[PDB]
Curated annotation (Swiss-Prot):
Impact upon substituting D177A: Loss of enzymatic activity on PET bottle and on BHET
Keyword Transit peptide belongs to the record: no
Binding site for poly(ethylene terephthalate): Y58, M132, W156
GO cellular component, as recorded: extracellular region
Pathway field: Xenobiotic degradation
Keyword Metal-binding: no
Subunit-level organization: Monomer.
Family (UniProt): Belongs to the AB hydrolase superfamily.
Effect of N212F: Increases activity towards 1-naphthyl butyrate
Gene3D superfamilies hit by this protein: alpha/beta hydrolase
Inducing factors: Highly up-regulated during growth on PET film.
Active-site residues, Swiss-Prot/TrEMBL: S131 (nucleophile), D177 (charge relay system), H208 (charge relay system)
Protein name in UniProt: Poly(ethylene terephthalate) hydrolase
Length: 262
């Protein structure tokens, strides 16, 4: 059961600011269980694509995570970036709101007036998000093991125990993070997971915002995020090497991976 879309990938095609597909977007008129949303979608994917829901961190809005919308959608995904009901929502609330955004993407897929009418395979979903939104993605993964992939960035939760997670999980970490330090957040979270395909990519000298909109590593972080979601959401074995490989880059201060075949 694989869903291969678009051309065979290259390091160049994955590092490029845009994938093969044309992207359009819309504002969600009446958000259902979250604050606000922008849906990014390919106009010409040539098949149905999985959906990814992306949540910001405490105080933060869609602008912090917006770069993922076009980057992922242009390789064959529907991406919803959300604002939370409150900028001060905690990780459990962020998780509920992430899953509500995936639910509304499914609703719009079934809405004849929506630009994503019949564009989504609702069987193939993924979760991403920054800091408390990264915590929220891991909670979403632990509560909903049918999710095909998770790729949180600089995750924080009040607990680091995610030992139940079976969803393929890529953690972006920021080496000099002083908000959710790697040694007390991202790494203990990574270490807790013994049941899944997983990866840990730490950005050299990165602050807490090292994977946000306006970061200086979008070629490397974009290639890894796209490759992970293509490998695991689409079961697209053309991305096994990109998804699972040590990228061998002086911008990476630490690389870890388990249960990930090349």
């Amino acid at each position: 059961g694989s869903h291969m879309r678009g051309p065979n990938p290259t390091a160049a095609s994955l590092e490029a600011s845009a994938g093969p597909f044309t992207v359009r977007s819309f504002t969600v008129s009446r958000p259902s269980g979250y604050g606000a949303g922008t849906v990014y979608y390919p106009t010409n994917a040539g098949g149905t694509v999985g959906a990814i829901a992306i949540v910001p961190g405490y105080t933060a809005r869609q602008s912090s995570i917006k770069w993922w919308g076009p980057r992922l959608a242009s390789h064959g995904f529907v991406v919803i970036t959300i604002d939370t009901n409150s900028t001060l929502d905690q990780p459990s609330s962020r998780s509920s709101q992430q899953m509500a955004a995936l639910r509304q993407v499914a609703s719009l897929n079934g809405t004849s007036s929506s630009p994503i009418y019949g564009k989504v395979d609702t069987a193939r979903m993924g979760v991403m998000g920054w800091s408390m939104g990264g915590g929220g993605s891991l909670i979403s993964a632990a509560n909903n093991p049918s999710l095909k992939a998770a790729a949180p960035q600089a995750p924080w939760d009040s607990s680091t125990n995610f030992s139940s997670v079976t969803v393929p999980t890529l953690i972006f970490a920021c080496e000099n993070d002083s908000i959710a330090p790697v040694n007390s957040s991202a790494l203990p979270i990574y270490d807790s997971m013994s049941r899944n395909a997983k990866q840990f990519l730490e950005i050299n000298g990165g602050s807490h915002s090292c994977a946000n909109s306006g970061n200086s590593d979008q070629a490397l972080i974009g290639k890894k995020g796209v490759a992970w979601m293509k490998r695991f959401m689409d079961n697209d074995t053309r991305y096994s090497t990109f998804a699972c490989e040590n990228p061998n880059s002086t911008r990476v201060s630490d690389f870890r991976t388990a249960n990930c075949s090349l």
